[PDB]
Design an enzyme around this catalytic site. Structure first.
Site, short mmCIF file in Angstrom:
data_model
loop_
_atom_site.label_atom_id
_atom_site.label_comp_id
_atom_site.label_asym_id
_atom_site.label_seq_id
_atom_site.Cartn_x
_atom_site.Cartn_y
_atom_site.Cartn_z
N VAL A 1 -5.75 1.26 5.69
CA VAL A 1 -4.41 1.49 6.25
C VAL A 1 -3.84 2.75 5.58
CG1 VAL A 1 -4.00 -0.91 6.89
CG2 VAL A 1 -3.29 -0.13 4.63
N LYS B 1 -10.72 -8.55 5.27
CA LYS B 1 -10.41 -7.74 6.45
C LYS B 1 -10.97 -8.34 7.73
CE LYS B 1 -10.53 -3.61 3.69
NZ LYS B 1 -10.78 -2.16 3.56
N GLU C 1 -5.40 8.19 8.14
CA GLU C 1 -5.15 9.11 7.02
C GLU C 1 -3.62 9.28 6.96
OE1 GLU C 1 -7.77 9.39 5.42
OE2 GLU C 1 -9.34 9.36 6.92
N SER C 2 -3.01 8.82 5.86
CA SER C 2 -1.55 8.73 5.74
C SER C 2 -0.79 10.03 6.02
CB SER C 2 -1.14 8.18 4.37
OG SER C 2 -1.57 9.01 3.31
N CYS D 1 0.87 -1.20 0.00
CA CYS D 1 0.00 0.00 0.00
C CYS D 1 0.89 1.23 0.00
CB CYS D 1 -0.91 0.05 1.23
SG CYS D 1 -1.69 1.67 1.50
S1 LIG Z 1 -6.25 -2.97 -1.55
O1 LIG Z 1 -5.10 -3.70 -1.15
O2 LIG Z 1 -7.32 -2.70 -0.64
O3 LIG Z 1 -5.76 -1.48 -2.01
C1 LIG Z 1 -4.68 -1.36 -2.92
C2 LIG Z 1 -3.37 -1.48 -2.47
C3 LIG Z 1 -2.33 -1.42 -3.35
C4 LIG Z 1 -2.56 -1.25 -4.73
N1 LIG Z 1 -1.49 -1.29 -5.59
C5 LIG Z 1 -1.73 -1.25 -6.90
C6 LIG Z 1 -0.57 -1.49 -7.80
C7 LIG Z 1 0.48 -2.32 -7.43
C8 LIG Z 1 1.55 -2.55 -8.29
C9 LIG Z 1 1.55 -1.94 -9.52
CL1 LIG Z 1 2.86 -2.25 -10.63
C10 LIG Z 1 0.54 -1.09 -9.91
C11 LIG Z 1 -0.51 -0.87 -9.05
C12 LIG Z 1 -3.01 -1.07 -7.43
C13 LIG Z 1 -4.10 -0.99 -6.59
C14 LIG Z 1 -5.44 -0.73 -7.20
O4 LIG Z 1 -5.99 0.37 -7.12
O5 LIG Z 1 -5.95 -1.76 -7.80
C15 LIG Z 1 -3.90 -1.11 -5.19
C16 LIG Z 1 -4.96 -1.17 -4.25
#
Ligand SMILES: *S(=O)(=O)Oc1ccc2nc(-c3ccc(Cl)cc3)cc(C(=O)O)c2c1
Ligand SMILES: *S(=O)(=O)Oc1ccc2nc(-c3ccc(Cl)cc3)cc(C(=O)O)c2c1
Lengths: 239, 239
Positions: free
Chosen positions: B70, B57, B83-84, B30
């Site tokens: 998170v 979750k 909130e980050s 994340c």
């Molecule tokens: S989810 O886990 O609830 O939220 C979430 C976390 C992390 C995300 N990371 C990506 C991502 C990861 C690697 C690459 Cl190369 C590109 C994008 C995408 C997304 C998303 O919006 O689908 C994440 C969602």
């Protein structure tokens, strides 16, 4: 009355801000800029106001904020600060008087978390503008109630009249301008099942800072009428 | 390796945070939670990590953050902050060590203004996910370049390597996690006509804090593969 008239396309760029004052580029009916003005008033900060005609912007205003949005603070040293929440925090830190944000890191974070809780409300003004009939209006009320229930929970948890405690503080002023316009939007019923939030509104209206800046329903509607007619005179409603 | 495994639906709620430590509820991939972890590391703050399986979750996690997102900080006194950007500012204020935000009200506001400038970039990850072919990809690159040119202008104006000066500071860490994933998204060409931004990326990768937390391209793609397959194991990629 005439000194408040907005500066638009073709106006001369204003001169430097005098020592001892700070300037806000504002518009009289912008809720984001009202945040900053609330803070200026609450902290007793000497300032000048330049209103910007947002339907007919001066080209020089983009030199103040490249995004062309109010509010913008400009001080005697030539520094420019924009984004409403940033202008408010800047003022609270840079100037003496009543501290609007707590010193405690945790309690300050709590205020900011409530501000994040509120984040969907300003975009519901767009939903309001796009609402055209009684069916759209029913759905709109439900959208406002959903957000207002979240704020009601904050006040229930804290058992205080205001969002930061029993004294008015930064968070209250940051959210107030959208509540100010509820009656004019005919959305005042949306606080009917949020009793603590409803009492909060009544307490806010009695705050000397809020009371000093409050715009009447009739003025709100005057502005809105002209703004939706796309008038370049909207910003100067009432002069 | 196994202690990093995420807690999901049916896991026992964790015990209190020990005195002397702060806990972060995080997920290893994340970018919002990476902000907080960067700050924890940069400031040398003793902490424990609980990863949350965001596809499955635990019900108790909504007691930590009612929004179920998170990062969340929990300290020994039981206080919860989420909130980050708020978690990061909280840490900078509450703990000793390297101050990541300037003391000067104006220079701190500038960092926050750059953060607002960056605000469209995180939602372009959604645009990336929805991009299905070479034509969508061309448009996506143009969307990233548009935002990156704005950041390039900040570095041109300042003539410094980092967004807050010649030393790395809060703002750099707040924006870094989205840049970390550019190569894995195949969007690294989008910094080709932003030379100062490109050098910034190379300098960031050499920062000891960034280097300590950086995730490899292969791991990024591993996670993404599983996440788009909707796997409840995505969050634990590599264990
Ligand atoms: S989810 O886990 O609830 O939220 C979430 C976390 C992390 C995300 N990371 C990506 C991502 C990861 C690697 C690459 Cl190369 C590109 C994008 C995408 C997304 C998303 O919006 O689908 C994440 C969602
Ligand atoms: S514009 O001036 O660039 O931006 C702007 C400013 C203020 C707005 N106020 C309203 C409004 C006013 C009164 C009432 Cl009762 C309801 C809503 C609406 C809008 C808008 O989004 O159209 C504003 C825009």
């Amino acid at each position: 009355g005439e000194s408040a008239r907005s500066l638009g396309k073709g106006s001369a760029p204003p001169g430097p801000v005098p020592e001892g004052s700070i300037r806000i580029y504002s518009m009289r009916f912008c809720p984001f800029a009202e945040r900053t003005r609330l803070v200026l008033k609450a902290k007793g900060i000497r300032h000048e106001v330049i209103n910007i005609n947002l339907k007919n912007k001066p080209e020089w205003f983009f030199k103040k904020n490249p995004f062309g949005l109010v509010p913008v603070l400009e001080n005697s040293q030539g520094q420019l600060i924009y984004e409403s929440a940033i202008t408010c925090e800047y003022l609270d830190e840079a100037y003496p008087g009543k501290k609007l944000l707590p010193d405690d890191p945790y309690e300050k974070a709590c205020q900011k978390m409530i501000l994040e809780l509120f984040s969907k409300v300003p975009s519901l003004v767009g939903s309001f503008i796009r609402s055209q009939n009684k069916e759209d209006y029913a759905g709109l009320k439900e959208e406002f109630r959903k957000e207002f229930t979240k704020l009601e929970e904050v006040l229930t948890n804290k058992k205080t009249t205001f969002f930061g405690g029993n004294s008015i503080s930064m968070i209250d002023y940051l959210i107030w301008p959208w509540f100010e316009r509820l009656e004019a939007m005919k959305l005042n019923e949306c606080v009917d099942h949020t009793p603590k939030l409803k009492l909060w509104m009544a307490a806010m209206k009695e705050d000397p800072t809020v009371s000093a800046l409050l715009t009447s329903e009739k003025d709100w509607q005057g502005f809105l009428e002209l703004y939706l007619q796309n008038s370049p005179e909207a910003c100067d409603y009432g002069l």
